[model samples]
Target: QQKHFVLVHGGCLGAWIWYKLKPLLESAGHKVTAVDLSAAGINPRRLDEIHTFRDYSEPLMEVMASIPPDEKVVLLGHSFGGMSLGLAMETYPEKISVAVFMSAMMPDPNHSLTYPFEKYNEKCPADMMLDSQFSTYGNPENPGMSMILGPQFMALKMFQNCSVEDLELAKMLTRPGSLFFQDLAKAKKFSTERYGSVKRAYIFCNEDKSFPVEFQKWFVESVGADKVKEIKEADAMGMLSQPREVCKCLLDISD
Candidate 1:
């Protein structure tokens, strides 16, 4: 079977993060599609007026909608993108053959949609974000915040194991991003019948200073996965640091 791969990038990043792994998977004869969420990538939308997390995920929903109903694809989300991926999985369970969380914050049907973020914050340290910038938007009743990762933080935390070129590309290409905390707070719960029915796999990237390996394991312990794999040397940007290894793990899952 020629499985299609849909890649979702995390906070402050875009589909560009899959530059290395996309081609690798493509060369291996699997189709690949990487989505840039609203205001995340080259997406021109500015984060001015607050929008629900679902509105921010419209791009991914569009992609999922366009896929042929008869065909199922491998859906993978990295880091914060896992939340959006959970939305995708619930909405199109029959279309997604499997969902992969790559060193990501895996969400479960239980609890509010904000559970993942809240738990993640508890595990994260005060200086975890390093020099990243946080700016507020909208009114206090429903405030929105966006963050742009600093060069120092990106170099040290997100891409420590990555090469200089890759790190530089990240620094230059990064755009302001949001966790959409306000929106996620009132968001609807994912359907266990749909999101839970899909096969799930988690890819553990040991060197992820941002998401961290310990937190990743906690996610698995709570939510559980059908399969789990690891890349010992990968940082938060596993696609950049260990493209071949990531591809191998994906291929294994697709098999």
Candidate 2:
């Protein structure tokens, strides 16, 4: 049977990041729909215009809505995209057959996406790659605009595990996006009957620096993923570095 995959990119990244995985899935007789969330990717929206987490994630929500009711989607989210996927799962549980968190944020109803970072911040090491990566715009306490990643940091922090060519490509495409810290804090609760009802999986990138493997493990523990997959030598940008491996895991999880 053929499967449908909805790919959601993380912060500072657009649908362009999934170019490596799209053809691989297609070659295996699957369909792929990659999305660029508001303000990120090639979407023309500006960061200051995205007022809420819902606004930032509008694109995926629309895609999920467009999927026929009879056809269930295997929703995959990377990094910040996981938060959006969780929200979609809550709102449209029947539409998603399995939700995949790929080295992504796994936020529960009670916590924001930043919860994990705040909880583990002390243990994350001061000189972590992300320390000097971000350039925050607007209010520091309550960010209303975007947190742009420095070009050098994008290559150093995100694509460190990938090839030099991929790193250079990412530097040219990466853009600023609203982090949605405040909006996510005030976002609605995810229903146990809805979000929790869907089958879930977690894919961890062993070399991931931004959302480290330890944090991914915590998410698996916290939410109880039905399945778990691990990729070695891939950082947060596993889609670019370990596409074949990531595709294998995604296919394994699909019904």
Candidate 3:
């Protein structure tokens, strides 16, 4: 049967970023909807006003709630959206057929992104890698703007994860990244063990420097879902840095 796949984007970017793979999936006899979560995309609003995880998910959750009763959608999220996907799946598990996390954070039980950024790294690197090329790089008044790193930075972080083609696509479509600290502070929790019932999988960019693939896999396994599948981040489009393999392993497990 044909499937429905909803593409959920992470912070600082809008819905337009998924142009490459959308056609590929549609040609495969599936339907895809790329979402622009609140505050991150063209939604005109002050970043400071948007607080709480639910507030972040308002746009996505509304879409999920409105899904047709007869159809089950495949929820795919990249980067920060991975955590958002988990929470969304928990809320609307029935509508979700498969949940795929691409080069994203797989937070373990009682653990959050803050735990890692604080304990690991010890110091924040990549000022050069993250700053803007233009004179007005980031708005210090709004760190969220700084969080939205440009394509150059994305390329650096995802170099190991994507291919040349994928990198180009990323460069073309990507907007700003999320506020590093704000996302880490507000969205670092599951609130409830809602993902226990969902069929979850993680697709890591092996060459991805964004987050160690091993650590991402570890969190996926820790969740103790029905199963877990891992894919190299590089093969998944401009995600890590290049185009996803045309016949790449799309992680789907039937319950």
Top candidate, metric TM-score? 1
lDDT of 3 by residue, 148-218 (tens): 45666666664434466756755665554443555557654554456656777766556555555665565
Candidate 2 Cα lDDT to native = 0.82
Question: Residue 233 lDDT in model 2?
Answer: 79
lDDT (CA) for every model shown? 0.89, 0.82, 0.61
Give the worst 10-residue stretch by lDDT in candidate 3: 246-255
Which is the better candidate, 1 or 2, if ranked by lDDT?
A: 1
Error of 1 at 40 (Å): 1.6
Query: Which candidate number maximizes lDDT?
Result: 1
TM-score of each: 0.97, 0.91, 0.73
Candidate 3 runs further than 4 Å off: 46-48, 112-146, 150-152, 159-193, 224-247, 251-255
> Over 4 Å off in model 1, which ranges?
none
Q: Report the CA-based lDDT of candidate 1 relative to the real structure.
A: 0.89
Error of 1 at 34 (Å): 0.9
User: Per-residue alpha-carbon lDDT of model 1 for 1-255, expressed as tens digits?
Assistant: 788999999988999999999999989888999998888789878766436788788899999999985798899999988998899898999998889999997888888889988888888887788899898877777778988899989999999999999999998889888898878898888888988899999999999988878899998899999999999999999899999999999999779
Kindly give the number of clashing pairs for every candidate: 0, 0, 23
